[PDB]
Amino acid sequence: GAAILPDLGTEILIPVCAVIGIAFALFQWLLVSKVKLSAVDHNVVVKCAEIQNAISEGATSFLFTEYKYVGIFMVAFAILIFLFLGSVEGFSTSPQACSYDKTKTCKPALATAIFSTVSFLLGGVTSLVSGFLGMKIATYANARTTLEARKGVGKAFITAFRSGAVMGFLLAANGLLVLYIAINLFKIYYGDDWGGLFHAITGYGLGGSSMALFGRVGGGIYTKAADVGADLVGKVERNIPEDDPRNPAVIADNVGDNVGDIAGMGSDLFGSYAESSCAALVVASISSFGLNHELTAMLYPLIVSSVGILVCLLTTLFATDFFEIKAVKEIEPALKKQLVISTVLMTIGVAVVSFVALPTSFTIFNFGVQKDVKSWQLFLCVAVGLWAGLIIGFVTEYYTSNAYSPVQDVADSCRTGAATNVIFGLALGYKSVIIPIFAIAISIFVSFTFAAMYGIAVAALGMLSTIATGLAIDAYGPISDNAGGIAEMAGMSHRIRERTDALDAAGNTTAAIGKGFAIGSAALVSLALFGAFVSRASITTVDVLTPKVFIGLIVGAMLPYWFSAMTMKSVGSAALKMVEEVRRQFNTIPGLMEGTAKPDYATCVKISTDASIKEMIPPGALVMLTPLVVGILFGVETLSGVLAGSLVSGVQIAISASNTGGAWDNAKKYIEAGASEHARSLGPKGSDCHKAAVIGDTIGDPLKDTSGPSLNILIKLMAVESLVFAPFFATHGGLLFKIF
Amino acid sequence: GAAILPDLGTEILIPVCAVIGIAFALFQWLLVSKVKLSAVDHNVVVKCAEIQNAISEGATSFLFTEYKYVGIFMVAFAILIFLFLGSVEGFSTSPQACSYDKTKTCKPALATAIFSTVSFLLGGVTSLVSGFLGMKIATYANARTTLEARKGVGKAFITAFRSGAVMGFLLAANGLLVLYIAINLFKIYYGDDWGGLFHAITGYGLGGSSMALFGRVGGGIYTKAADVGADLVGKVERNIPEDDPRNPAVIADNVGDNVGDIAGMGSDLFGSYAESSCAALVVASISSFGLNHELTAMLYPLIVSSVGILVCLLTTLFATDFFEIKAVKEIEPALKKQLVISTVLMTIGVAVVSFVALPTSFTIFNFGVQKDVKSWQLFLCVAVGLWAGLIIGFVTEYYTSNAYSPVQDVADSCRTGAATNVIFGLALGYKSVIIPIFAIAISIFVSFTFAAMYGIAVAALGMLSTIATGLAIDAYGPISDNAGGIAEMAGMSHRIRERTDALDAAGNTTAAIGKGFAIGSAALVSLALFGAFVSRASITTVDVLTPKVFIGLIVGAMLPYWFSAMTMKSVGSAALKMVEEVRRQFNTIPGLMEGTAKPDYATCVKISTDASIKEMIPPGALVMLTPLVVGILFGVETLSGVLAGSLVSGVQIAISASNTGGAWDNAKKYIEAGASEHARSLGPKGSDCHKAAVIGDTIGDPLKDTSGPSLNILIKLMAVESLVFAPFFATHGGLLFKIF
Ligand SMILES: [K+]
Ligand SMILES: [K+]
Ligand SMILES: [Mg+2]
Ligand SMILES: [Mg+2]
Ligand SMILES: [Mg+2]
Ligand SMILES: [Mg+2]
Ligand SMILES: [Mg+2]
Ligand SMILES: [Mg+2]
Ligand SMILES: [Mg+2]
Ligand SMILES: [Mg+2]
Ligand SMILES: [Mg+2]
Ligand SMILES: [Mg+2]
């Protein structure tokens, strides 16, 4: 029948939790504000503050530029959405039989065409705010982390983690709240037509991820162009420290961290959150929950997320208060414990939520038939995703942390030069896919078996139920990155850089981990969305052994490579420019190498601004146009193949790129830190071994920061896009087969 | 209906063409014998023949070693083939109703369990002979190519190309003759049970690809460990010319070209040919050709191959007689003319064959139903694969020859160091997959529609119809590669090496093209076998949106990466050892760097001998065990997913790795040749640009020569293997689902 938790209870619980998540984030921002500094040893607090201003000014500046374009694109694309969805019923205004129940009347397809546009814009905008907010907190916390490092690793860790949590909590609560608001607003018009309500609502994730795609690639190109240029000429050529203020590309590099690893990453994960929620909602909308108009159960995913916010708050308190770091070897397990604790607490949280928000029996729509599902089967659906996530974290840590043998061997291979470094690095990344894929496959199998597409979507959301914490441990990294950047630029003592280098190395692992969650959840949500698309397209069977499906499958499997070709080439080209620029300034500015002359930072900022803004367009277009072109020309069966193929194929390359990139970075950190006999025998900085690592790191740069992480967006974006345009491809698509 | 050409004529025609092909091969060998030399400036000729002997001894010594292990394994696996297939009908000896026509009676399954073992071993042995005969001609032709280079490139080119033709006509004609024999031999037992006959014949391809997986991987690891070692210490560290007899790894390296790029590749393409024929045969055996016992049409594939030889013979004359070569500008065009001419003639050829060897109307088995097909549609099926082959060749040249921009930009990117070289090279390879996939997709759509799994399989044969030429142009490369290594080692003039370097460069592009054909044809044949596998396993539908298929799909898609992880790491490790070794000799043996002392070659041969024999086992096991493990534990649905997944995923990485690898190679050559202002700008040899390219080149070594090309075996092997064991899996597999 109904659940223990009455509807009005749900309607209160959700926004209350969002409000708690927001209040908690503000509180943390407030605590961080205790670290004082101003640009008006005293000299060192003044240099930190000016550098921080430079970075802040650059990051805010680029985003406004980027968002202007993306914002325009968004508005264009929303028009396409209205037009195409609107034409499905020739823009009629009349009601129609509910496609999920012929006996009832549903709102016109036109309404949905309109509201899908509204949720799209909503998601687009929210995705922009997610990246902008993360950027504001990161550019605020970076120099404060630097100053706090004067007292030790532990203190700096706290200010970087707290701030990472500012972003995590803000993003989760705001994404939750907006969606919650959107649903309640849409419902006023839809009333009893919940299928229409929730089918319109899915624009929200389409919005989120479209904007994310450009945010990730734009930011991604911007940052790696600087990073490669700065590192190659500075470290490999001119034998100076990494973020040396003599290096004209350092400002661009550090801004790059906020603009890619933060803003782009933030948008990326918002889209993950939005899509997973949306995919669970559409399926439930025509399951027993939606048909019987049972609000609490319908909003199950949002209740899961609300509780995630609370669990993550708790988990946060452990790292922030109940515990203290005194030694560097403690940083990574601190971070790892955030995942362990949250996963355990959330397992209990989901149990409770599954107990009180689900009737013990219900039906889940399953390709035209109401499948009987029990609430303990559902618990296992979200729990299996949540646990697959954790497994993925552990495996990814094992492959990217310099505490373990894979990366150490990679560093060790530097002893025979760059070529062996790269071979080992590539080999490592390839190897690293094995277990996450099994974890994903297991997740699919359990969740698919128990509750079809709905179960799979709820597994995705389970993997993202602790998104607040996931984001915190991840956002922690770029802030720690800037901290050391600012330390070197501020001429602070070697003790500070060693501390930031410890934080930053842990950040590399944490980043690989976040990528892992992004890929894992993306594979889940995409499968669910694929299934939903299939019903909506009135496809009876996706048969791999039909010519239309199979050509789609193989072409779909190529797109991730097409996409990587473009993004790699962009970074490669922009970095080539950057290096020529950096060399020139060392070669022609008297006193630069000497330390008496100040370099031109703006020119480097300009090179990575010009390249990113321009070169984000073709890959964005590839992804976004593909479902349209394929659906219109070849049709829904073929598009089917493309969805499956880009899923199973993209996922392998996404994982191996992000991990290979991470492994190289930390293999270099291992050499730079020389905190063991092995490490030292590879040093010191400047050695042939070290420069070999730098070469690896630098090749890994676009792998793990531009193409790699955007691949998960490629996959999940094409999937909501397809679901949103499904009736339009069903009705007006497959032209090439119609004319012939 | 039946065909113009009588069964008796077909029985005569086939071996005549085979005999002709062998007659033409021996002839070319005799001409090569004209270039006389011996061991036991004429001081050169003695040194060359001394050098040639170290290599010939090395190649031979390794293959025997390698073939000892493979042969043993070949025996073990054959037992499994007998046990597992025997267990289908409890090892009964009674006849049984035909699988395809219940009204009729068919031979015992046990009989087939036996013949499948017979054809398998027949295949393994014919594979080993293919690689061995290729090594023998190559090891005989290399020094002959060196000596005739004293009279310009043109004369050195013919001895090289004639020798390439020797391997190509022996392989194409021997695989044909044995198959033909095996069929007729098998017929004696099977009589009217053609279904049983040609299902028994499929073991042939399973055998060929089985004894090729190990030869490609094993030989690919021997070479490349040597290659990376010799080049990194030689050129990058000690600044001596490539293949300098000072370098203790040069003998292994030049042996490696024969043991990997000749032997391994020879076996690879044998598998490709055997599988394509066998695949075409099995669908035909239960089509109207096999039901109505129409022999000529039944052996249509073997008839296509037969005219293939003749056509390729004619085509070869154009390079051997009808047209000569002066400018190095001409070599690449001469090689590419061989593709174009053979493709045109053979288009007419297949038209002839299709007009005389097929009834104008017939039926093709189509997933349980006889599908009406017209002989002109079959013409199109093989032609589309034939032309797809040419397209793939052209595109592969565009992305791998240093006469075009992609590779030139890659070389150019060396100006900013090894990292930009690697980033650019990686991007290029990714890029390069687009058009070939499209070609493959088009071939599939056209062939699948017309004639189902038969068309597709016949499209694979179409792409391989000119294999005699394909092998000629490809084998030519390693022969040229050795010819330059011997020149250096014999200390002939700069002008000698500069000529072979041009021949070698042509060989690089030519080896990439061979890789395209291998990958292109493998995608085609695997899909047909997959199809065949599906009927044979009594699967109604391969539905992507089922838990069993989907987990198969994503896991299958991971396999190519797991396999690449092993093979890359293998070369990485062996390469690390080889460098440590070449350095050891350079630092200890007094006056070695001078030339007053002889390096210990045997040590370097041992490091690579030890690595390859050991390290080829796991990846072989992975590919061999996967169907068995998946089919038995999870069942034929999941294995369906695995097969589809490993196909669409593995092809992307196979192409991109091969092209990247070829690209870095030719970019290095480009600099080394300095035949333009731009090339000379990056030089001279020893320069930073040249070293950065060497780094890129040695990273690409395992990419194009170990992992990359082996992947096409991974895909096609798993497909035949799955087909052969289908009844077993259908009957006794799926355990994990039965018990729970
Ligand atoms: K990081
Ligand atoms: K070659
Ligand atoms: Mg850097
Ligand atoms: Mg950074
Ligand atoms: Mg940094
Ligand atoms: Mg890092
Ligand atoms: Mg970096
Ligand atoms: Mg080499
Ligand atoms: Mg070689
Ligand atoms: Mg060579
Ligand atoms: Mg080569
Ligand atoms: Mg090589």
Side-chain angles (χ1 to χ4, degrees), chain A residues 212-221 260-261 264-265 268 515 705 709-710 713:
Chain A
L213 183 54
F214 296 106
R216 207 70 160 101
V217 172
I221 292 171
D261 307 23
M265 186 276 285
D268 184 352
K515 251 98 106 172
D705 284 320
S710 303
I713 311 180

Side-chain angles (χ1 to χ4, degrees), chain B residues 173-437:
Chain B
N174 210 78
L176 177 58
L177 183 59
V178 165
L179 178 52
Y180 169 87
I181 289 161
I183 288 170
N184 283 115
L185 280 181
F186 278 33
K187 197 169 73 160
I188 293 171
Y189 174 72
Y190 280 102
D192 270 343
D193 187 6
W194 287 16
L197 201 175
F198 291 106
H199 279 77
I201 279 305
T202 73
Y204 190 51
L206 173 59
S209 277
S210 283
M211 279 68 255
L213 183 65
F214 293 96
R216 209 68 167 101
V217 172
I221 294 169
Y222 184 110
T223 202
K224 270 56 245 177
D227 197 338
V228 171
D231 294 346
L232 287 187
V233 192
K235 317 165 59 158
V236 172
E237 292 184 1
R238 306 315 205 94
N239 300 327
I240 62 185
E242 173 172 289
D243 301 309
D244 195 286
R246 272 168 286 167
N247 196 319
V250 181
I251 286 304
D253 167 306
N254 269 243
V255 155
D257 296 324
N258 288 288
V259 119
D261 315 34
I262 282 293
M265 178 275 292
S267 281
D268 193 328
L269 272 282
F270 170 71
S272 269
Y273 160 76
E275 296 205 33
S276 292
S277 299
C278 291
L281 295 179
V282 288
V283 189
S285 77
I286 62 179
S287 292
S288 73
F289 297 157
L291 300 176
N292 304 344
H293 308 99
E294 299 166 4
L295 194 70
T296 290
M298 180 71 221
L299 305 182
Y300 174 83
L302 308 228
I303 299 188
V304 167
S305 293
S306 280
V307 173
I309 286 190
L310 266 35
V311 167
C312 287
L313 191 151
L314 264 24
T315 284
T316 315
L317 301 176
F318 289 74
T320 208
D321 295 346
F322 309 158
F323 212 147
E324 251 297 302
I325 320 95
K326 299 147 288 182
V328 302
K329 199 87 163 60
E330 304 184 77
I331 313 163
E332 288 205 346
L335 266 359
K336 197 175 70 192
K337 264 317 212 303
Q338 293 303 265
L339 294 191
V340 181
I341 296 179
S342 55
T343 299
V344 180
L345 295 180
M346 196 60 207
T347 306
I348 309 183
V350 178
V352 178
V353 168
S354 292
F355 178 80
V356 298
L358 302 167
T360 51
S361 308
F362 44 91
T363 61
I364 292 290
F365 179 83
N366 189 7
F367 293 105
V369 158
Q370 297 298 320
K371 179 188 153 70
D372 300 334
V373 180
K374 298 284 183 284
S375 60
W376 63 268
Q377 298 161 355
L378 256 193
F379 166 73
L380 285 177
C381 294
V382 8
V384 72
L386 173 59
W387 283 94
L390 189 73
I391 275 64
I392 286 170
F394 279 145
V395 184
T396 301
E397 183 181 77
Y398 176 62
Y399 282 105
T400 61
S401 177
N402 60 39
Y404 302 101
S405 79
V407 152
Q408 274 169 11
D409 291 9
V410 167
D412 188 64
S413 86
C414 292
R415 282 158 36 219
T416 49
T420 38
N421 179 224
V422 171
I423 292 173
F424 267 83
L426 287 179
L428 179 151
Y430 295 158
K431 185 59 156 159
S432 81
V433 311
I434 308 168
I435 297 140
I437 288 307

Side-chain angles (χ1 to χ4, degrees), chain A residues 223-224 227 253 257 261 481:
Chain A
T223 185
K224 293 308 108 181
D227 199 335
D253 171 304
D257 300 329
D261 307 23
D481 198 5

Side-chain angles (χ1 to χ4, degrees), chain B residues 529-571:
Chain B
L529 292 171
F530 170 43
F533 162 79
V534 159
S535 297
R536 200 80 167 104
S538 316
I539 311 183
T540 302
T541 311
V542 184
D543 191 348
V544 186
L545 283 156
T546 58
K548 294 180 177 187
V549 172
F550 203 87
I551 70 171
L553 193 71
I554 194 178
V555 166
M558 172 273 292
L559 294 184
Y561 282 86
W562 186 353
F563 179 90
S564 294
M566 283 178 193
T567 55
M568 285 285 282
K569 171 72 161 313
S570 259
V571 174

